[PDB]
Amino acid sequence: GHRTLASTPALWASIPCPRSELRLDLVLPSGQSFRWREQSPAHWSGVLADQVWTLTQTEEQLHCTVYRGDKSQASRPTPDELEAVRKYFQLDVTLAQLYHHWGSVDSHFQEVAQKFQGVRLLRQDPIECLFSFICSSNNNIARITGMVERLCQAFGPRLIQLDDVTYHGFPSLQALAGPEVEAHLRKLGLGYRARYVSASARAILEEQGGLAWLQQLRESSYEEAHKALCILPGVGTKVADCICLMALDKPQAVPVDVHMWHIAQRDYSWHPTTSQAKGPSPQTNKELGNFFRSLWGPYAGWAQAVLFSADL
């Protein structure tokens, strides 16, 4: 079954990481990745790179364990595996520097940060992020979490079973580009966005030269990446910004939806001054995003994530 640090200590290895730099409970269930669950108190299990991990923390350390299945002997994560975890959590960025900057320009942020410490922005795989945000509206974390689980159960490789939980890899393009994908996703309860999952997979595979197209957007400017993503069925401005932020290494991206508007009004008394519109629209949404980029700086999307963790 699922491991705990206490039950099987020799299968865990550690990364130095103060709780000031990372709070798993404030990050993993906060609406960035949908692949994690707290199966044991303070222990988060999920898929990171088509492998199952469990993570837990002590005061100065992130402890990690990886499940290898029947082909390999059980052993602690290797140094390269642990680096993969560090990259996922972007641990080379000093969060304290960012928090100090954001609090210096934003008193509301500084207030919220006192309770919501160690909220980091994950660095997600581009396929996984794209298709997670295509497959469901992101109106409720519980809904999207369920839809993503169904998608991976449907078209993702079976990795391992732990207790009553069967973990799947994220689906491949080829899997998602099949005939019958839409219909089978609608049969599982995904509804009209099932069509976008299929069509976007086929678009990337057939028309854009495959996975490399999407991977190249990590190196491309925010402007090029956003525009490129918007060509895909099911991706408009907000999803494209989500992907840019969360998987294409554009920390400046600030996705704008009704949730962000609510925070802007509730916590900032913000009103648009460019647009004629009083409410969400393409022009006013752009304005809002540029507002927070201008306020918070080049890591504005990371600052947004702190406020989203606090709002849950």
Side-chain angles (χ1 to χ4, degrees), residues 1-86 88-96 98-113 115-179 181-186 188-194 196-210 212-214 217-222 224-226 228-237 239-274 277-282 284-285 287-312:
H2 288 85
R3 296 165 187 166
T4 58
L5 175 63
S7 69
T8 62
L11 293 175
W12 291 83
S14 59
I15 298 164
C17 185
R19 299 180 109 120
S20 68
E21 287 290 307
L22 171 68
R23 282 280 299 286
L24 297 169
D25 54 325
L26 299 181
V27 175
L28 304 179
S30 73
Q32 293 185 43
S33 178
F34 306 105
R35 299 285 260 145
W36 300 92
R37 312 284 187 272
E38 192 182 9
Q39 299 279 347
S40 308
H43 289 70
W44 297 83
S45 296
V47 179
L48 181 39
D50 298 346
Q51 310 174 271
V52 184
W53 288 80
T54 308
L55 302 177
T56 190
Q57 57 197 313
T58 56
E59 187 63 17
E60 292 295 321
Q61 301 175 83
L62 175 62
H63 305 265
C64 310
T65 196
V66 63
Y67 302 85
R68 313 188 184 280
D70 67 17
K71 295 188 294 181
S72 195
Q73 299 211 80
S75 64
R76 289 189 291 280
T78 69
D80 289 308
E81 287 172 325
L82 287 176
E83 185 47 30
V85 172
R86 296 194 66 262
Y88 185 75
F89 287 102
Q90 308 202 242
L91 295 181
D92 291 330
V93 181
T94 305
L95 196 60
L98 295 179
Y99 270 46
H100 170 98
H101 176 64
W102 297 330
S104 83
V105 297
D106 180 353
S107 289
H108 172 250
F109 182 95
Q110 187 170 240
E111 185 188 326
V112 163
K115 184 162 174 219
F116 296 89
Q117 297 273 119
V119 175
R120 305 203 79 90
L121 185 58
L122 308 171
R123 177 166 192 259
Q124 305 178 224
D125 175 75
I127 294 286
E128 177 170 306
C129 191
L130 169 51
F131 288 95
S132 296
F133 284 107
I134 284 182
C135 80
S136 182
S137 67
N138 186 37
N139 284 322
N140 295 94
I141 292 163
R143 185 65 187 183
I144 180 151
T145 300
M147 296 308 101
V148 167
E149 187 175 340
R150 283 167 202 194
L151 173 67
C152 296
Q153 180 172 356
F155 292 99
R158 188 186 166 109
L159 302 183
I160 204 169
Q161 186 167 43
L162 300 169
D163 302 305
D164 279 333
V165 184
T166 307
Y167 288 86
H168 287 259
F170 200 82
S172 63
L173 292 175
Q174 305 69 16
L176 288 185
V181 169
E182 183 186 341
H184 182 31
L185 296 175
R186 293 180 167 276
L188 299 171
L190 273 71
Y192 71 105
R193 286 172 159 290
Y196 298 150
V197 165
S198 170
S200 281
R202 286 167 178 185
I204 292 165
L205 210 52
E206 289 164 15
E207 284 157 41
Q208 300 306 319
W213 171 79
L214 179 57
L217 301 185
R218 209 163 248 193
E219 168 60 35
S220 297
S221 66
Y222 174 39
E224 281 157 285
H226 189 281
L229 292 170
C230 289
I231 83 178
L232 293 168
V235 181
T237 303
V239 172
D241 274 334
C242 296
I243 298 157
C244 282
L245 179 60
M246 293 189 236
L248 308 176
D249 293 331
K250 315 312 181 220
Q252 71 265 45
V254 176
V256 169
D257 57 356
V258 63
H259 183 23
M260 192 69 165
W261 274 77
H262 179 225
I263 287 171
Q265 295 173 155
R266 183 186 70 197
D267 295 331
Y268 298 89
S269 298
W270 181 90
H271 307 271
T273 63
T274 70
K278 306 283 175 148
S281 77
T284 54
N285 292 349
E287 188 182 353
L288 187 48
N290 281 339
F291 174 89
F292 284 100
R293 257 190 301 285
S294 180
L295 175 64
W296 287 324
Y299 287 80
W302 298 33
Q304 178 185 241
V306 182
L307 303 185
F308 285 5
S309 287
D311 207 25
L312 291 177

